[PDB]
């Protein structure tokens, strides 16, 4: 037992007001403002938060927060990382409290992406999720964590070694006429992290969030079209996770992938040379 | 495989007659009197008993009895405790027979709470449970054991180490504006033991018993109100176990927590800063 | 829609104290004494009662109480009986209140058995069933009513005509080397009333009561043997209802048939020439 | 409510000993000999019998026995037949007892096939089915009756009118390059009676019996091949009932159709111009 | 993985003809006679046999045959027994073929009961079970093996050590006012072997066989009563396995325990001081 | 975790055009021609292919391709084979790409059958299976792989050792009056590889392919009969896998076994001395 979900993530942004409107109106996320001068939160479920939005930022990813079941797994994984030669820091109580977790360690993946491992998230059971716009349904989180990210890597083999140590499984799932793309899971979500060896100006290529209801995905798509927000890739279904998704611009320039109907992860490695349908390029430059 | 349930407990009381009326009328427990001069039994199910009520007492907990599956697990856990430096005594046949078990060992937890580990409880299949008052339903026991207790500790870290060795799982689940409260499970019951570092005049803070039917919980609540018995904390739902419960005075001064609809234990550590609703203070001094 | 269950019955007895001990210890029925000088009640479930036990009696049946769904069905069946030439009396409020029902009519079946038709039984939801001895389970009642009775008839064809008018279905199900026995249902209970053309000193041959648990039936059987109460017919399984049952003496001389595992009534008429096994004569003269 | 199953049938044979061996070894039916000089019985289930085999016979069908639910349906259908101009006879008790039924009437269908309508078959629950050879499974009977027959008709429209009056449903289901074949159901069995306008030397073309297990059908097929019994039509699946079946000679010259996996009857009329596969002619002259 | 079922057993008898009639008529077992001069077989299911009945015998147990999953488990358990100091013999092909198994080893338990361990039983799928009398149902075998036996032991602790090594689980389950009785399982059958420290003239106290249907158990009971065969213990339900059973004499003097409705084995050790009901002594001297 | 399915196989043929017509018309496989001069593909499902058909061939098996879950299992099994003394070659990227897999190693089994182990098959999710003739259903593949093969062996013990190392389970399942036949599984398919010690001119005795629908199996059988293709063994059911199958000639002379309704593999070794029914010899010389 090691990493069990993508529990939270932090991003930094240059336009917090635009991000609040985008998150609520375009996606249906809930804005939680605790009156902090430099950040606010986005909720998806009973967790106090799933995304921390830092102000005065770089319009990129700040950290991914990977959950382990408890203290025993936290301690075991820490030692495992040390023994394998990785540089980690166990955080003090102030730093853990900043993230609202019971235990916290910080490191960087082989691509330079700041990576946090924690146990004991804060759950606000007294405060049920209340979406930023009316929703037919809710989000798929639970044992699948918040969603998935594709992040920049320079050495795919080293990236794979690192995430394997963290307890992820997966390998090259697409060979695109040849670019190889690798996808890894740490729970039932088909993938939680993925990467290839392509150049990228930003740490974060995209974040995928999953609705329980197709009606919310469709309405989200309609919101993007109505507000003339760039759709980088049109609606389609992935050969790996079988989800219906599209990719749209965020105010930070990296992409959001709203989706629906993701399939369960499998440990039997398969690869494909294309998607089931759709996901055609529309807006260029992403 | 180690401890699998809170199998029995012993308490001592100053007023056995009051305890008989309380147990039967207020809670629906069954009184079994085997004609012993110094004790009687309370039943909840087919077990010969779940609670031993000793006379001429201190109005506090006398022992918690933790079950293991069988002799192999009993022997293994005994040696484990010895190897870790804890002081245990394997009881002879007379002492085992007193508790009506096939094998028995005695120790104390780090807080000084007398702790028994046993295998092979006596089950009276010929003698079905017959509650002390008419019930709509029955009690939740089975693989969840009799209920849960909160007991006094002086060193939470040492307590955690001890119960971890016994096969329990769990950690700090509430941070209350800061008091930290730890809750541990050894089966599907969300918790069977819990504790914090607060001072306490008694070993036992409260015992929780769970009804299968909301109607019995409601009627129990009504019995407390009708008989003007102190309700220390009003009806509410816990963020951790999701049960509907209240807390009322017993004749011994420590609290009973009658409840309904407890959720299954989880190994993924979460924490909260408050309950879902209710559990407001009413009667003070508990 | 007409008669839907055997809702209650009244019996009269010469020895109420013996009947109280018998009902509680031998059968597990609940005694309810409302302080009336001339009667007490036996409960099986949430109904205020299922059996009224009148004192200063004849050790026989006093009345069968047949339930209809509501007032519309009550009125329709009343008129149906009148139109077919049967003599009925619609009872006033005092008489209805005596039986604790909202509407009541009285008549006699063609065999002279006093027959009541009612709607709106009193249900004491606040007062859950509490058996007269510890039980593993409870009784089968609900949409199947309290049980079944075999009652005396002089003209089977006329009896059949009467119960058919009341909404029962069924005919000759046994031809015994030749005695013909007829069995009729008004709900899922395989039969609620049955009869043949044999002579009988009493209105009531037997009453069948059904346990949910085989363990209670077995213990009941053991109670009869231990207390040296006559077993008229030994354990066996009926070809029609497939229940495991035996027949034992009551203090009134007519028989009780405790049983378990009755099958659902069928509208497709079948007959048999014997039972599946058992039901051999033991104590003679019943 | 009218006819609900093909309950029994009678055949007459010239070689009873050959029929006993055939029924037991080739089909797995149970022979019941009640010591009558002129007949024996074949069982398939708990019914006393499903087929009566008369000696000194014509090697053809003697009667089909159609069940109604009870006396009310029996009386109603009798009057219906009379009112429509058909000739029926209500049988006395001796004649009913010969067939082991509670009520019996006799007529002929428009093709001259002797037709009986009855209620109240004799079920020997004390005497479970015991097949004439070891079987993996048993027969499909229950609410589907014993099987189906194809019988001779001279006027298909009149036949249809008659069976419609009896409560059957169905029409032309095959148009074979053109011969029209009509199939009618009276319960979940896809068909219980069928016919066309072709000439036939015998009343009975074939009887279909259905096994619960494919292994028994296969072994039956193997028995026919091993004993060099004519297979008139090879294994195949019918477009209407979707059953896997073959057709083999009986000692009487008409055909048995052993089968497996019949589909539920439908009230929505369909037709086909051929079967799904197989049912090719092998032995000619049937 | 070690012993997974009681696969077969061998007994020797003085009166084979009496045993054939008893097995078929009284129990519904199938007699298979392969024309061997010194033995015949009893079947319960698709296995070639479950019981070997040797002639010219001692009216006692000859061997218990314990199945392991395959060759790897066979080899591992053999070495385990050798390493623990037990005396075993690996049988040659002739001896294995005598038992109709692919691999066979022979030893004796600490009580002197001949004990065989094997893999690869012969299953006659072509030859479905055909009971020796008509049955409503069949036997419970499959992953539960043929039944259970109680056998003589002189040293219960040594017996327990031996069966524990074989992969069984269980301990003292009854303390009878004090006699201790131990019961061990190797699959879902509540127990497959049991023993105490009481003296016994024979190796075998009783064999329990389980019907799928209560109707067959009842009819079996009726057969014993009708044929005036001693019933040593009357119908009752065991506190441990919850089965309805009785105990009757066999022609060899040891007891058969026909039963119905056995519960699943549990690894959590419980004990009782009596049964649920019944099992009263009738015929003495067993 | 080691081999998890028969993922693909390669055959070589002398008449590719005949094989195309045979595969499509007689079996319903899909022909995929990628324009390669020396080979084409047969599909059964979403995999790019299940069978590679090489031209200019020997009318025999060229290779069996055994799948492992992923790279870790591939590497572990490779080392396991090396450590046990087997000769393996890890293939370069060109060779892996030829088979359309992410990782590939080559060896020979002890019988000389070329054996490939791979991970990461190419799945064409964009290109759903389209059978070569209309089908009622599809093929059974998924976690059961493509089917099973019987291949030539010279030393059954060495063969068993090799496939055991690969993670297969199974042993002798038939003893035929004596020829011993061994059957091994690596997933839920009852067997994926089988063999005996009989002489064979070809590596491949037969390939079994399984339909989801009996109607397709029947139609396939009909196609063989219509086109006068040799049926070596007639329809029957295997005692081990319980499937309905027949065996027919392919254009290469080795046999295809089309079938339906295979049972789940079991780890508990059984043997038989014959099939359930059928599988009688028809066309000789196979
Ligand atoms: O390393 C792994 C992490 C998670 C899963 C997993 C968990 C639940 C469902 C599906 C896959 C599988 C893995 O091999
Ligand atoms: O420009 C990019 C396009 C696609 C991916 C990508 C998508 C899925 C998995 C791995 C990488 C990453 C990129 O930086
Ligand atoms: O979640 C994802 C799953 C699959 C692909 C993908 C599919 C085809 C080509 C490139 C990327 C991209 C994703 O972001
Ligand atoms: O130490 C442990 C003891 C018991 C359970 C458990 C058992 C059943 C359901 C849920 C949790 C989980 C544990 O980690
Ligand atoms: O006065 C007290 C109040 C609350 C708890 C408590 C409740 C739940 C878990 C741990 C400690 C313990 C106390 O002694
Ligand atoms: O069973 C229990 C679960 C949770 C709490 C609790 C909740 C909030 C604050 C303090 C204690 C107390 C309990 O007795
Ligand atoms: O007159 C009738 C009364 C009751 C039922 C019935 C109701 C429920 C289940 C089974 C039979 C059927 C009848 O024909
Ligand atoms: O002496 C009697 C014996 C049996 C029945 C009886 C039992 C079942 C149905 C109908 C009548 C009625 C009697 O008066
Ligand atoms: O409820 C009953 C069901 C069937 C019979 C019966 C069975 C055989 C012969 C006589 C009566 C008697 C009953 O009291
Ligand atoms: O006249 C009819 C007789 C029987 C059925 C029937 C009953 C059960 C299942 C399917 C069809 C449908 C009819 O229209
Ligand atoms: O020679 C015959 C061939 C076929 C049928 C038949 C089969 C099915 C339905 C209706 C008639 C009837 C015959 O007399
Ligand atoms: O039960 C039957 C269902 C269908 C046909 C049939 C099918 C095609 C042509 C002719 C008869 C024949 C049958 O005996
Ligand atoms: O040694 C053992 C052998 C068998 C079972 C078992 C298997 C299936 C169901 C219940 C218990 C449990 C054991 O501890
Ligand atoms: O005479 C005897 C009576 C009972 C048992 C027995 C029954 C169950 C378990 C263990 C021993 C064994 C005996 O030899
Ligand atoms: O299978 C058995 C289960 C339990 C007992 C038993 C129960 C009470 C006292 C003595 C033996 C005896 C058995 O043969
Ligand atoms: O070596 C083995 C490989 C596969 C299975 C298996 C997997 C799924 C279902 C049934 C058997 C069992 C084995 O012992
Ligand atoms: O001629 C042959 C006949 C049968 C098998 C065979 C079939 C199943 C399993 C193992 C071998 C192999 C042969 O070479
Ligand atoms: O898949 C198969 C399963 C069983 C046998 C078999 C059965 C009996 C005798 C010989 C081979 C042959 C097969 O090809
Ligand atoms: Fe994505
Ligand atoms: Fe609590
Ligand atoms: Fe009755
Ligand atoms: Fe037919
Ligand atoms: Fe027993
Ligand atoms: Fe095969
Ligand atoms: Mg994946
Ligand atoms: Mg917890
Ligand atoms: Mg009836
Ligand atoms: Mg039809
Ligand atoms: Mg046990
Ligand atoms: Mg196998």
């Amino acid at each position: 037992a090691a990493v069990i979900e993508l529990g939270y993530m932090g991003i930094s942004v240059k336009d917090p007001d635009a991000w609040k409107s985008f998150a609520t109106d375009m996606l249906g996320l809930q804005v939680l403002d605790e009156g902090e001068k430099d950040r606010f939160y986005l909720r998806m479920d009973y967790w106090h938060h799933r995304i921390v939005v830092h102000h005065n930022g770089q319009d990129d990813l700040e950290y991914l927060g990977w959950r382990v079941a408890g203290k025993p797994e936290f301690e075991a994984l820490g030692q495992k990382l040390i023994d394998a030669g990785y540089k980690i820091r166990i955080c003090d109580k102030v730093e853990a409290q900043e993230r609202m977790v019971l235990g916290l360690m910080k490191t960087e993946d082989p691509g330079g992406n700041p990576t946090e491992i924690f146990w004991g998230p804060r759950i606000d059971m007294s405060n049920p999720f209340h979406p930023g716009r009316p929703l037919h349904g809710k989000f798929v989180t639970g044992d699948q964590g918040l969603g998935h990210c594709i992040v920049r890597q320079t050495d795919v083999a080293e990236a794979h070694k690192f995430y394997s140590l963290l307890g992820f499984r997966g390998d090259v799932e697409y060979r695109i006429p040849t670019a190889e793309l690798s996808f890894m899971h740490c729970n039932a979500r088909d993938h939680s992290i993925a990467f290839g060896a392509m150049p990228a100006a930003k740490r974060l290529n995209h974040l995928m969030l999953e609705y329980t209801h197709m009606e919310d995905l469709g309405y989200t798509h309609q919101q993007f079209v109505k507000n003339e927000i760039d759709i980088a890739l049109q609606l389609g279904i992935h050969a790996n996770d079988k989800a219906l998704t599209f990719y749209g611009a965020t105010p930070s320039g990296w992409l959001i992938e709203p989706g629906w109907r993701g399939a369960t992860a499998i440990d039997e490695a398969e690869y494909y040379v294309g998607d089931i349908f759709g996901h055609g390029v529309e807006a260029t430059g992403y």
Side-chain angles (χ1 to χ4, degrees), chain A:
Chain A
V3 168
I4 62 168
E5 61 168 289
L6 179 57
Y8 64 81
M9 64 191 289
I11 64 172
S12 64
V13 303
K14 301 192 188 181
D15 193 338
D17 286 340
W19 260 95
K20 293 180 177 171
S21 294
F22 178 78
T24 58
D25 300 343
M26 305 297 104
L27 303 175
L29 295 168
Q30 172 181 11
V31 166
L32 174 60
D33 189 341
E34 297 273 18
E36 297 172 81
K37 284 185 189 180
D38 66 345
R39 76 197 67 188
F40 64 94
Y41 304 96
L42 297 172
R43 306 186 77 214
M44 302 178 65
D45 58 17
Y46 281 111
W47 285 42
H48 175 274
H49 63 265
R50 294 295 193 158
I51 304 169
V52 188
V53 187
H54 296 272
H55 304 178
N56 280 210
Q58 315 284 68
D59 282 325
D60 203 355
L61 177 69
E62 289 296 323
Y63 43 88
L64 296 175
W66 296 106
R67 188 189 184 186
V68 300
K71 191 184 272 183
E73 294 81 18
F74 179 85
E75 290 175 0
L77 180 48
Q79 195 57 57
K80 199 188 194 185
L81 281 158
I82 291 169
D83 294 349
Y86 298 96
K87 289 186 184 183
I88 73 166
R89 186 170 58 86
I90 309 305
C91 301
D92 61 37
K93 287 173 187 188
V94 164
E95 259 181 300
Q97 290 174 328
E98 177 183 13
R99 299 295 189 254
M100 299 173 200
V101 302
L102 297 176
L104 183 61
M105 69 173 67
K106 287 173 186 182
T107 189
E108 282 182 5
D109 79 3
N113 305 304
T115 298
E116 305 187 351
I117 300 162
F118 75 97
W119 69 277
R122 176 180 158 171
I123 312 309
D124 290 341
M125 291 307 304
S126 63
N127 191 22
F129 173 66
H130 193 55
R133 72 163 198 244
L135 292 181
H136 298 272
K138 58 187 188 185
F139 288 96
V140 171
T141 59
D143 52 26
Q144 296 185 66
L146 70 85
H148 71 245
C149 289
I150 279 48
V151 298
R152 179 177 58 203
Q153 300 295 342
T154 61
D155 186 329
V156 169
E158 282 298 312
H160 187 277
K161 185 182 172 298
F162 178 80
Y163 290 100
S164 292
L165 189 153
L166 269 51
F168 292 70
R169 170 95 178 186
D171 214 291
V172 170
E173 291 178 357
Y174 288 83
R175 297 196 82 252
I176 303 303
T178 300
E180 296 191 323
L181 313 177
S182 294
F183 297 79
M184 304 185 80
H185 60 267
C186 58
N187 56 39
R189 188 178 292 281
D190 176 83
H191 49 288
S192 291
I193 197 68
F195 41 78
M198 65 282 289
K202 292 183 188 281
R203 293 169 172 165
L204 188 58
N205 175 258
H206 76 271
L207 161 67
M208 188 275 174
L209 302 176
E210 189 180 345
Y211 293 108
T212 56
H213 285 57
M214 171 170 63
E215 294 85 3
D216 289 324
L217 171 62
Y219 188 86
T220 285
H221 183 270
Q222 175 181 102
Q223 292 281 77
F224 275 71
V225 174
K226 285 205 189 304
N227 288 270
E228 307 188 287
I229 303 170
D230 281 356
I231 291 171
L233 291 181
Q234 299 171 330
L235 283 162
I237 291 177
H238 292 306
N240 60 6
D241 73 1
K242 316 308 187 284
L244 183 63
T245 83
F246 75 99
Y247 298 67
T250 74
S252 290
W254 52 263
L255 298 168
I256 192 77
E257 182 189 10
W260 177 68
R261 203 204 65 168
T264 302
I266 60 170
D267 278 2
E268 302 76 31
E270 293 180 356
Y271 80 99
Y272 324 94
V273 303
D275 261 359
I276 297 183
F277 81 87
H279 285 148
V281 176
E282 181 171 305
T284 57
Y286 292 97

